[PDB]
Amino acid sequence: KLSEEQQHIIAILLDAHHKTYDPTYADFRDFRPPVRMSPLSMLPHLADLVSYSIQKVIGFAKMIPGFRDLTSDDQIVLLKSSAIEVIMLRSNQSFTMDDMSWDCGSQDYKYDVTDVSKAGHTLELIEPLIKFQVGLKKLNLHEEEHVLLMAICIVSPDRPGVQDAKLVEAIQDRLSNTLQTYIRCRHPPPGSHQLYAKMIQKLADLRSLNEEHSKQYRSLSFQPENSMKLTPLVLEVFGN
């Protein structure tokens, strides 16, 4: 029993994702070129890809019903904390179980564990990242579920530095109710069973990955030489 509002919410989140996610990956040609030889050799390319993906996530977020009613400061706090997580989430669409890699339509734009290693991150982060991708991919989400999960991740009350937790919660709640009802009404067994609880668990996994990223990012970024390889938006969003 999907309300008219709920069907509305889904239609908006699908369009917003379509407008901010190009399944052809055409823009990837504008990044500094990938290099798979030295140490940090994929960093310039992958920082570009991250920076781009931050812009696209910001453009998705702005379309989330209710998001615009938040304060500018709270919008900032939510994006800054969720950015890496949504990039992780949104990355699942290019992630392929065959190769255990992210496949962006080209050999040059196909990323594996070793490429991520060339970004300067350890296996301590990379291993759980790939495991995350595998478990998320196995959920086999409908695109409606996927777009809802992204929006729910962005509008989390439980983010440090939030001013209006209560308004953020009421925005999320309406997305959570929309998702729950969608799974029940639009999702067929067996795919649907405990699907919500598993989607909720991925949000928890993302938080742990986010913690580990911030740590390795401080280590990477702490050196000025490495920091120079990043983009101005990546430095503003992640830190410096």
Partner: peptide, 11 residues
Amino acid sequence: KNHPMLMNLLK
């Protein structure tokens, strides 16, 4: 708070 780029992209 020191986020000019993010703020500009948001609106």
